[PDB]
RNA sequence: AUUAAACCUUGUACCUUUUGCAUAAUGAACUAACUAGAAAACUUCUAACUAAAAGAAUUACAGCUAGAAACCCCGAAACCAAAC
RNA sequence: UGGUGAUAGCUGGUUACCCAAAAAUGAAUUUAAGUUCAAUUUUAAACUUGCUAAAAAAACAAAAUCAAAAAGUAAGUUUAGAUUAUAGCCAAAAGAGGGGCUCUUCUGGAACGGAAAAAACCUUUAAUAGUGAAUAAUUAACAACAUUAACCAUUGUAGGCCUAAAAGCAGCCACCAAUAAAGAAAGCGUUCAAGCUCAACAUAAAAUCAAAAUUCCAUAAUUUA
RNA sequence: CUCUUAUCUUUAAUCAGUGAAAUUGACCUUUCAGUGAAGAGGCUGAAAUAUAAUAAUAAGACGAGAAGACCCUAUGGAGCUUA
């Protein structure tokens, strides 16, 4: 319940998804050493350090895909205007 | 399907607040209903997307090839445009992304509240 | 049998949200054109790989190590 | 099917409202009014302006043939019986020589129409019915009483 | 499950068979023992030796030699011979 | 008694565990409880495109068949060996006979949730522990008003028609007048007519459909956002 | 029979001795309505309900049943006979 709330706000719909409360550690040492990171914690990470990967080679090679379109243009525009002796 | 229902109108444009230019490049889907009872093209094209996990967010370029594979399963599946409003993430902070709710995927983590 | 007031209201819902994603599916950015050929190169990298690995089948290899070794299982207190 | 009647519900025809009911609505505008019941004006215009006395007396459930037999007797009185439906009479001060006559000629009532002081004919006439109440007589287009209209006959 | 054996909550016996369904239909008082898949012509695999292989009879233009790998039970109405 | 463990495409039974893969199309058959052929599946080997999609386009008549480039994606083709399977069920569409049914063709299904119990309808990607959380389908649902209400009915003429007679009113006519208002008559009455009213005139006042035989069968309930 | 009654004997019931058979998945073995294949002690929804005993009757569930009864077919079989 509350979901739509949440959402209205900028938050999660569900607590449970993103949110410092989930992902921070839940524990530290009582000596102060730093807990180390948790297995859930650490496998939702990479699954977004890999998405962070393929959304910056998609942009890369949508990028191309218009700018070769602009180079592929200039040939077609050049190859118009053509002379020779 | 008749392109009519594609072809926006002016009042659309201020509902969704999109602008007819700058078309946005991204698109983010989800699979929110099940295959199961539905004809083999239905269940075929979802596959072949890759929406095999209801809920699951995908990153997906905003092409014809790709416009039209969605189009086939509309009803099946969430559109949202991606929003970067910090620009590409860098390979330093490529480990620091988060997409949010509201479809703007920040580049930086920083762990602050909102609020 | 008559249908229930929150049956209605659900599907209404759901049928304008699916209406948000006819908006979003009407503004293609790019046109046929640029489209075609700008991933010829990365798809044809990919099926290559595909052949090598599926094409890795053979028989296993025999080794001395593993006959010798099974005497080891008379292994025992001096 | 269950699921074909939930769509056949949610596209249910949905009428709009009314601010305000047709029988609750604020004063509207009415059509500029039309006269239709003309003749008639022309024929009760002609005997009033002919005849300057007239008097007004109550109509007993009198029969038709009477009347016609009463505007020959009158003939001999110099006076003539004409009469015509009363639901026109009302608008015939509205347009004609004068418009302060309406109290004079309320409800249905035999109106003797005479041009001439003929104090005595008029007088037989209300002999011939005393059970018939004579209202009065309007002489030279006045308003007066029965028993001033014998006064001022004198 | 529970402090608590019964109460409250959940749950349409079993085998076989019918349609991939039984509130059908068969079979079962229960206990113990007994009670139903068996063959190597060729192939793959494991090794020997090799233009040769096999301790005689076989095959061979890499073959040949050895090993291993397989196919149930109970139950008719009957038919015939010889005695009684 | 022996042949004899006769035979039986028939009936019944046929004893430990775990992982993987796995579908009642076409042709013939004393054939439809089986078997062969095609097709599938399958093992090995050879080496490279395949599946979805796919513009213009012809073909047809004036969204599939075909398939450029793509794109999403990872299998595919050929060679060699080899079997198993070869009876559905129900829902929902399109046809064809009947005119509910009888068929042919296409699609989907096999909860531990829901529709009352519910193989076939809806929500549902596998299965793991937890005294967590967000959601999906989800037995119920809130009579019809937009011309018609008071009063009166005089006269020609019983007008001509076989009608004895039919006078508004058996038939039958055409279809005028006076009057303020009279239908040459609208329903009544009719030995025939006299005679009952409706329309006449005067006086009234109005204004597009809904929410059969054992014993009833949750209980109830109209408003705190 | 109208129109049944009375008595005796057998059975019956009590005591003591001896002591079977068909049968049997397990049963802590209810009513009503629904559902279903004509169909419910065991499902759905209502209702009823100290435990255990004891003694009586055979109408219905178109009761349960068999290879019972009757008639006819087969371009079915098989057996038998021929002129
Ligand atoms: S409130 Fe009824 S007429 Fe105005």
Same mark, same amino acid.
Request: charged share 25%; glycine share 4%.
């Given at each position: 319940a509350?979901?739509?709330?949440?959402?209205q706000?900028?938050?999660?719909?569900n607590?449970?998804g993103y949110?410092?409360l989930?992902?921070?550690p839940?524990?530290?040492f009582?000596?102060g050493?730093p807990?180390?990171?948790?297995?859930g914690?650490l $496998? $939702?990470?990479?699954?977004?350090?890999k998405?962070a $990967?393929r959304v910056?080679?998609l942009?890369?090679?949508m990028?191309?895909?218009?700018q070769?379109?602009?180079?592929?243009?200039?040939?077609?525009?050049?190859?118009? /205007? /053509?002379?020779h002796? | 399907?008749?392109?009519?229902?594609?072809?926006?109108?002016?009042?659309?444009?201020?509902?969704?607040?999109?602008?007819?230019?700058n078309?946005?490049?991204?698109?983010?889907?989800t699979?929110?209903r099940?295959?199961?009872?539905?004809?083999?093209?239905?269940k075929?094209?979802?596959?072949?997307?890759?929406?095999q996990?209801?809920?699951?967010?995908?990153?997906?370029?905003?092409?014809?090839?790709?416009?039209?594979?969605?189009?086939?399963?509309?009803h099946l599946?969430?559109?949202?445009?991606l929003?970067?409003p910090?620009?590409?993430?860098?390979?330093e902070?490529?480990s620091?992304?988060?997409?949010?709710?509201?479809?703007?995927?920040?580049?930086?983590?920083?762990?602050?509240?909102?609020? | 049998?008559?249908?229930?007031?929150?049956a209605?209201?659900? %599907?209404?819902?759901?049928?304008?949200?699916?209406?948000?994603?006819?908006?979003?599916?009407?503004?293609?950015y %790019?046109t046929?054109?640029?489209?075609?050929?700008?991933?010829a190169?990365?798809?044809?990298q990919?099926?290559?790989?595909?052949?090598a690995?599926?094409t890795?089948?053979?028989?296993?290899?025999?080794?001395?190590?593993?006959?010798?070794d099974?005497?080891?299982?008379s292994?025992?207190?001096? | 099917?269950?699921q074909?009647?939930?769509?056949?519900?949610?596209?249910?025809?949905?009428?709009?409202?009314?601010?305000?009911?047709?029988?609750?609505?604020?004063?509207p505008?009415?059509?500029?009014?039309?006269?239709?019941?003309r003749? !008639?004006?022309?024929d009760?215009?002609a005997?009033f302006?002919?005849?300057?006395?007239i008097?007004?007396?109550?109509?007993?459930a009198?029969?038709?043939?009477?009347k016609?037999?009463l505007?020959?007797?009158?003939?001999?009185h110099?006076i003539?019986?004409?009469?015509?439906?009363?639901?026109?009479?009302?608008?015939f001060?509205?347009?004609?020589?004068?418009?302060? !006559?309406?109290?004079?000629?309320?409800?249905?009532?035999?109106?003797?129409?005479?041009?001439?002081?003929?104090?005595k004919?008029?007088?037989?006439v209300?002999?011939?019915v005393?059970?018939?109440?004579l209202?009065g007589?309007?002489?030279?287009?006045t308003?007066?009483?029965?028993?001033?209209?014998?006064?001022?006959?004198?």
């Amino acid at each position: 319940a509350g979901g739509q709330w949440r959402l209205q706000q900028g938050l999660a719909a569900n607590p449970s998804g993103y949110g410092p409360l989930t992902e921070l550690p839940d524990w530290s040492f009582a000596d102060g050493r730093p807990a180390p990171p948790m297995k859930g914690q650490l $496998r $939702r990470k990479a699954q977004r350090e890999k998405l962070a $990967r393929r959304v910056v080679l998609l942009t890369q090679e949508m990028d191309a895909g218009i700018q070769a379109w602009k180079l592929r243009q200039q040939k077609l525009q050049e190859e118009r /205007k /053509k002379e020779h002796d | 399907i008749p392109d009519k229902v594609f072809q926006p109108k002016p009042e659309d444009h201020e509902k969704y607040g999109g602008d007819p230019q700058n078309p946005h490049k991204l698109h983010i889907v989800t699979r929110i209903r099940s295959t199961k009872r539905r004809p083999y093209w239905e269940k075929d094209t979802i596959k072949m997307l890759g929406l095999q996990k209801a809920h699951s967010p995908q990153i997906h370029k905003n092409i014809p090839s790709v416009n039209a594979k969605l189009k086939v399963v509309k009803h099946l599946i969430r559109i949202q445009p991606l929003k970067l409003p910090q620009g590409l993430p860098t390979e330093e902070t490529m480990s620091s992304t988060c997409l949010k709710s509201t479809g703007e995927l920040v580049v930086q983590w920083h762990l602050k509240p909102v609020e | 049998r008559t249908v229930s007031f929150q049956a209605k209201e659900s %599907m209404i819902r759901r049928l304008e949200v699916e209406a948000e994603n006819h908006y979003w599916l009407s503004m293609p950015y %790019m046109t046929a054109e640029q489209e075609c050929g700008h991933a010829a190169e990365r798809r044809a990298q990919a099926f290559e790989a595909i052949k090598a690995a599926a094409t890795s089948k053979f028989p296993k290899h025999r080794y001395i190590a593993d006959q010798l070794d099974h005497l080891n299982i008379s292994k025992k207190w001096s | 099917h269950f699921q074909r009647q939930k769509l056949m519900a949610i596209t249910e025809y949905i009428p709009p409202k009314p601010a305000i009911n047709p029988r609750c609505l604020p004063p509207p505008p009415k059509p500029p009014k039309e006269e239709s019941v003309r003749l !008639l004006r022309q024929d009760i215009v002609a005997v009033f302006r002919d005849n300057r006395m007239i008097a007004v007396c109550q109509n007993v459930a009198l029969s038709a043939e009477d009347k016609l037999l009463l505007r020959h007797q009158l003939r001999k009185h110099k006076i003539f019986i004409k009469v015509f439906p009363s639901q026109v009479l009302k608008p015939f001060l509205e347009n004609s020589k004068y418009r302060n !006559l309406l109290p004079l000629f309320v409800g249905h009532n035999l109106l003797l129409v005479s041009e001439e002081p003929k104090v005595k004919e008029m007088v037989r006439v209300l002999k011939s019915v005393p059970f018939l109440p004579l209202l009065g007589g309007c002489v030279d287009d006045t308003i007066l009483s029965r028993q001033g209209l014998v006064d001022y006959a004198k």
